[PDB]
Amino acid sequence: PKDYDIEGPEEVKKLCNSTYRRLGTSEPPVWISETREKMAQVCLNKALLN
Amino acid sequence: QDTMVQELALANKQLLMVRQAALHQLFEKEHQQYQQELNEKGKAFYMERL
Amino acid sequence: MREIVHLQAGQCGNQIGAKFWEVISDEHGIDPTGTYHGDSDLQLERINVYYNEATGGKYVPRAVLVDLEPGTMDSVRSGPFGQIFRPDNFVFGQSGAGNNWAKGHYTEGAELVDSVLDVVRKEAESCDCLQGFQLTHSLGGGTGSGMGTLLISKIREEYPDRIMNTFSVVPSPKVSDTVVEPYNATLSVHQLVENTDETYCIDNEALYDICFRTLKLTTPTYGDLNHLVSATMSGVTTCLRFPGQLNADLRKLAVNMVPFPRLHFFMPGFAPLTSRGSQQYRALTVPELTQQMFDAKNMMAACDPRHGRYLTVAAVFRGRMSMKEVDEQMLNVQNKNSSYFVEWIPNNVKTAVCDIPPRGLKMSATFIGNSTAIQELFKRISEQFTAMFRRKAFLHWYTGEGMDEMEFTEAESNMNDLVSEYQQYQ
Amino acid sequence: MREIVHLQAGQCGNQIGAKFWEVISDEHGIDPTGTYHGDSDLQLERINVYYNEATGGKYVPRAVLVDLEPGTMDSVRSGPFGQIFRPDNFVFGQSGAGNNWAKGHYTEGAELVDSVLDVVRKEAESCDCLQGFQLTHSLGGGTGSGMGTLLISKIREEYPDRIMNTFSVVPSPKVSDTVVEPYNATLSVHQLVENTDETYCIDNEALYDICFRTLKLTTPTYGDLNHLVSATMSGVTTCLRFPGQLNADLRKLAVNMVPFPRLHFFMPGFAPLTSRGSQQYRALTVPELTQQMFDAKNMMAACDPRHGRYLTVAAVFRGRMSMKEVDEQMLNVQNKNSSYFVEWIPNNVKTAVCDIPPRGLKMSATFIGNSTAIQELFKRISEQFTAMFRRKAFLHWYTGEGMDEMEFTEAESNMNDLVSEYQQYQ
Amino acid sequence: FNLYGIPTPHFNDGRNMAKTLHWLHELQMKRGAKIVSKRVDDFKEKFQ
Amino acid sequence: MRECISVHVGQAGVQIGNACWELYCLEHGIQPDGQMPSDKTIGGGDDSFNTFFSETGAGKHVPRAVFVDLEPTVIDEVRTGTYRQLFHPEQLITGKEDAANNYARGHYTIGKELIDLVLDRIRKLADQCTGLQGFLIFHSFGGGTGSGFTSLLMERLSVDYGKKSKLEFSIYPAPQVSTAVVEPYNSILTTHTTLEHSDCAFMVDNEAIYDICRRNLDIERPTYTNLNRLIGQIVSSITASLRFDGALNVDLTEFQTNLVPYPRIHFPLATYAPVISAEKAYHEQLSVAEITNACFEPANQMVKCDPRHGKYMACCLLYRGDVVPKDVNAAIATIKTKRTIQFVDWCPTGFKVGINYQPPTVVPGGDLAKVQRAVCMLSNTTAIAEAWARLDHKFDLMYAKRAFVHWYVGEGMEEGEFSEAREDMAALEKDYEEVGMDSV
Amino acid sequence: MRECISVHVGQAGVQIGNACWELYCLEHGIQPDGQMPSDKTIGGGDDSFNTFFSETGAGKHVPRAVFVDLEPTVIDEVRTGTYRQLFHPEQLITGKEDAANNYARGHYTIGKELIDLVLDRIRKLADQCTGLQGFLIFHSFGGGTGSGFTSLLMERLSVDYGKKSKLEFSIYPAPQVSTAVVEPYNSILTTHTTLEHSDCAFMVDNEAIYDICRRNLDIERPTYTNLNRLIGQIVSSITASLRFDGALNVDLTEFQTNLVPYPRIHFPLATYAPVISAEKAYHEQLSVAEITNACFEPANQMVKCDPRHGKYMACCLLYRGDVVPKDVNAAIATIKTKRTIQFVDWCPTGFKVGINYQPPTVVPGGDLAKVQRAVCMLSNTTAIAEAWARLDHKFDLMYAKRAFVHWYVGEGMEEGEFSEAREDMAALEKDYEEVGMDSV
Ligand SMILES: Nc1nc2c(ncn2[C@@H]2O[C@H](COP(=O)(O)OP(=O)(O)OP(=O)(O)O)[C@@H](O)[C@H]2O)c(=O)[nH]1
Ligand SMILES: Nc1nc2c(ncn2[C@@H]2O[C@H](COP(=O)(O)OP(=O)(O)OP(=O)(O)O)[C@@H](O)[C@H]2O)c(=O)[nH]1
Ligand SMILES: Nc1nc2c(ncn2[C@@H]2O[C@H](COP(=O)(O)OP(=O)(O)O)[C@@H](O)[C@H]2O)c(=O)[nH]1
Ligand SMILES: Nc1nc2c(ncn2[C@@H]2O[C@H](COP(=O)(O)OP(=O)(O)O)[C@@H](O)[C@H]2O)c(=O)[nH]1
Ligand SMILES: [Mg+2]
Ligand SMILES: [Mg+2]
Structure with a gap:
């Protein structure tokens, strides 16, 4: 699964370009520090004869 | 106020012990005339080893 | 704020530097035009370290484009992210380096160091607080070893308190693509002993083997080869750019590493390399991360740590991790493997933790290490x-x-x- | 007071021991969340025996569950009553024992000893007056027979004045559920006789013949003959925790029944046994009840009472019943079968009467025996x-x-x- | 694709034994109360 | 927890994996991609997968297997087949040139070139696993990597690991058919280095599986796909107690301690009783009292002998589904009374039972009807010596005039192992007849 | 007004403070914004927030803290996080460059250019108070700031607030785990300068709290914000009498008089007590006795050092919640009978009790449960020597090679300091020896 290919059917083969935009595909959905996610948790959330 | 969460609890105890005693009379008095009414139609309750 | 300045000389440092801002513009969220298109406010806050500001939200990269022949200039501007580069930072001569240290440092070098220093002085005065410079070149070339070494000397004398980085592509043992590599590299390191504070020696087939046995593709390109180099120099300035729970900058990454002024030549390394068929088959975690981090088949310069032993090492970390395993799996490389560390330094590792992994990954780490194996x-x-x-x-x-x-x-x-x-x- | 601590060893002890905890949390009134929801205050009269008060009105049951795998505890910790227990008592190993003594009593047995005897100890002096220890295991498999027998040796050393109750599951006569049992049986009993005071020799097949003949159930599973042992097991200790006009703890049963320290071999029984279709066809009174208490088909050891003269007999009863019907009836039993008792003991039988029957019952009883046929x-x-x-x-x-x-x-x-x-x- | 072989109703947790160890004379008293004739009531207050 | 990895060496070993792993995929809702079926994907709900599967965090369940074989043609059709997305692409390793039905090539010549890859791969399975309970080595006895490689493969596993259990459910050379002429040579040699190391086998042939397919099932013209499926049904039943909690659990450690009488007798059966077509079980009511009788019946079992004189001496029965312990017990107490299924009098226990709460599963595209209950039986018998010294007698005809030996000694093999096999082989047949009738 | 200005210096101090201040904004209902959810409680009491939160015109309950660092990266979170409108704009101060794990920058360069501003803000805060019981400090005996700027402050403060409890709370270098190779130096350096400028130093180590958060709260992989919660519960149980009330009440001036024995041995190791996840707690008895016994255990101790290798010289058991004076007395009697716990001879007594009536507060999202009784025993054990010696061994292991000094002399610190401190720490170690020797 190559973003760019060097053996593909294209005409100009740029060797300076990489074949992969990223090192991996699985970036964390949201980007939040621990000092935020954690400290940002404070938010979150009888008788018969009275 | 901290006495009052303790005040209402003991007041619930007074009502509790005075309605159990009164309901005890009603249940025994009902059961006897339940037996009496059935005894006129030729039926009765089963007491174990009666 | 916390600005650092990036330099590069020659076509080797230019293809490094062009790919180095392929990945940071991807990281901060800069399009191939110049405008912001990210999704989080975290990657716009400390963007001052690499990207400047211009009217219209045009974040401009902070470099001085140094070479001696203009063919690489057309290679940079016609690239995918070559539009964002500031045009008068392209400083270029009209006669080539000759693949030579001599005319690159003495005759054709000295005719352009004034025109490079002027735009370095121009840029470095627009910031508030500067940590230091950062240069990528090749010791086997003519521009990077000739002019780039002269620029190291010139900016060190003008700014003595500032820290210095060089990312030198040292000549390769087995394959040689330049006969005068033992000449062009033995004079540039003569000035690297005193005029530089941090040196990251990088071999070329130490990129070829890792790109073959780990990234696992039989035909590599220079960009994939420069991709690994761009990862660690972005990984070194991780906590300098992004927040975290244990933050170390470039200077704090210097003090804890070298015990002596001249023994400052390092070994880079990037831990999470898999290949993309097995990204979904392998569970990525810290004990598997630090095992491949200290494994010397994943070493970014062609030296074997078995022949010598590490003096000190560092490993800054990315992503949302814990602290017990960046200690339990980090004492284990010391205690269980004790003969491969010097005994006169009791502890041997800097640990730094960030919260933000690079774009693409959840949890990463980069490795730098001083050694006798150099x-x-x-x-x-x-x-x-x-x-x-x-x-x-x-x-x-x-x-x-x-x-x-x-x-x-x-x-x-x-x-x-x-x-x-x-x-x-x- | 008179509290006893429970121990469950092996998988077999982990269901018949667990099934006791639904039975007795039925009887004391403890709901499976852990709190109290009953009707009578005599239920929370002596809760100190089997449970310890934790926090805010719940009664965590005191028991040390030991096994070499967590998967048999997967059916116990995630049972109906798995979250009444405490998770610290769930002590277990990592690999298999596999019915071997030298693997379950020597190699992998001895590793888990320190982690079981500390939680047996630290739970033992948390109370004031310890009555005894209450095992629950089998003799067929060495995962529990190996550990349970060793746990006897290390408890009897530092608790010599306590009563040992073991609920051993002896192998059935006809067919085995494990080929290596006769090694596991003799290697158990060799020091089970010399280090324990009470062992109950129940086999599975007599429990089957009960469920086929005097109960008329065609397919009752392992969750059904467990309730037959467990509900009987509560009536052995019913005079510890429920008041009666003639009380008998586990220990005056111990002093009375065994004459000589070689004989800790008892047989239980339970008195209301009959089918759903045979309920109105039967009279529930002790002249019509002690017969089946002494019947062959209500024996849990598959030993012939005609072959076996009873040595000493304990008969513990539940509910409001007369005491002349306990005593005159018991000699009325002895008259017709005087040859099948022993005559060097003037009174072969011990009696005890409690005043609280279980739920759904108006009057019940249970049996403890010691016969020649064991x-x-x-x-x-x-x-x-x-x-x-x-x-x-x-x-x-x-x-x-x-x-x-x-x-x-x-x-x-x-x-x-x-x-x-x-x-x-x- | 059908249920093949004999279905034997079984209850692995074991509520079948708890039903038959419940003595179905107070199951009726849990679900009510018996009504017998008077002359088994009056007879039995004399000779039992 | 309670995990155990598998190793599929040889063409027979890897093609059982091309049919057994279908069964596990249909058990725990694992689609061929390797995930929960897109929908019906809760946050997390079991640990039952763990015996033969492992998370990657995201939700893909990589199996715990090692595919090694010197012929890559048998490896490519799972690399390009339906299950290209299930297996990790690097654990599944091949060679260049096949061992070609030589024990010399599988242990001396080309076996050496791939020992480093498998043992490096097996140890990362062991490092990933937290508590390992056994080894599932799937290996035939005929070829050069089915027999020659597994002799060197488990030799290294028995010195680097030690006390871990070994399991086999594969194919033994048939007594009357064969697909190779050097099978009496390869099987006579791979037994030499797998006595004190292996603790299980499959002594019966594969034409008994032809007999069960043709005559128990209503199928004509059966094929290796159907044979591999029926063997995979038994591996799921022996490991059914490691994923699914039953009435009494029987995990992998006491398959060891119960089914071997002596350390050189480690040969249990493999008999799945309800091999019944959909067309017969609509017609027939199957009870657990008869499924053990049918398992012992010479019809339904694949015991290649006459079970009139099948002298069973260490039995193990495993049940799945709608079973009760008494109709296990009533059938198994009836069978000890019942005479002509002759047992050992000096082992009064003989049997052990295992009951699971999961009903037996079925794979689409098969002839088996989903039965409410099934039983798997592995009994160690001494009737194997009839089928054991005969394979030795199969070796003696070529032993005298040295046929096919020049391919061994010509390419890395000493002639002494051809002899040293024989006396250890005669000593093993001496061991089987020694336990016959000394107590009368 | 029993006020207490808190000074949190160093990346640790700030992180630790953020957490600590969440507990305070919860004990007293101070919405993470500044306003108190209109209510009257044991926290809304004008005499229950004053101890820390300063009142305003529109209930802007400001903190009396002063978070300090040199690298904006950390305090920018406390400035763009949940609690952004609380910490008054300039109560949180930052610089531009860090200290690069080096005491020199923290004391003779990057520090100097800031102390002025910081001291000025403390003068302002002090002015607002009416009884600054003490200036609680929180640093890091390892980084350039918590070792350097912290030192500079303690010194300058001494000649500005003078005799005024300067209680400390630092992350003393851990035994095996470590984040730097330039800590051996910084640590042995800071102590030498702060020794005669600090009153008490409730020390604590990262490794210890880690195990504590794995043996007890089974939070396997723990982050810093997890260990920073219990490193902040100690600060509440230490400063609880100056806020909520109770029977016996201890003050920020009592510790110095009841713990520190001689004017040099001021390093009381710390340990909390009911550390149980809200899942293993309920099912257990947490009574005064158990909690008290739990603290004097040779493991719950929050510093990787065993008391069984030393003598106790003063223990301060600070309880909290439904605690009964009687039970405490009996529990302390038992810990005296035990002979595995030994007290020095020159301390016949050695127990300082204190019973606040406010139960432990539950942070919204944490491993700790919602208990009712708690203890926090501070102990001046002579087992802090074994630690100081290992730090000393490290300093000498490298000072021999004059290593990692190039960037310590060239920042101001004359090479002399290294020896000055080294020799002084050697005196501390010899000092501890005599202090232990039982009287003759
Ligand atoms: N049940 C079943 N048996 C098979 C299957 N494929 C092969 N076999 C058996 O495996 C044997 C093949 O001979 P082997 O010695 O195992 O061949 P090999 O393992 O590939 O070794 P080399 O050919 O030397 O590489 C045959 O005799 C078959 O009986 C299959 O798909 N299902
Ligand atoms: N216990 C604990 N220590 C921490 C925490 N965060 C940082 N530290 C300490 O901080 C030290 C590393 O230095 P830094 O984190 O950079 O803090 P610093 O004192 O400002 O050091 P400089 O940035 O170089 O000035 C380590 O020795 C840790 O002990 C934390 O959350 N908990
Ligand atoms: N790492 C890396 N090295 C490169 C790349 N392109 C060229 N080189 C190296 O540069 C060396 C030649 O240097 P040269 O072109 O003379 O450098 P210059 O004179 O400074 O322009 C060769 O040995 C190559 O290995 C690249 O994209 N990445
Ligand atoms: N009474 C009773 N016995 C059981 C039950 N489940 C299993 N067993 C016994 O367990 C024995 C098998 O041995 P095993 O379970 O391996 O014992 P272990 O090795 O100690 O765990 C058989 O003899 C059964 O009698 C049950 O529910 N009730
Ligand atoms: Mg083949
Ligand atoms: Mg800092």
């Missing part, structure tokens, strides 16, 4: 030089340019002094 | 041992991880020592 990167380049300088091989191309033959004698006079201080702890 | 249980095991020990059939896994051959001979010599000490008392 001695034989200099032994062989001595043996390549001693066997070749003795019979006066190519000196007429060097002594005819404006430096005497005796300047070559001092080249191995302190390269062997680097060794004697490397060999003393072996 | 010998035939032990000769059959010796017959299945010597035929298997003559050619050293499965001996090479016992010798394989650290057990001597002579311990088999010492156990077999002690095995027939029990047979010879028992026939002379006849």
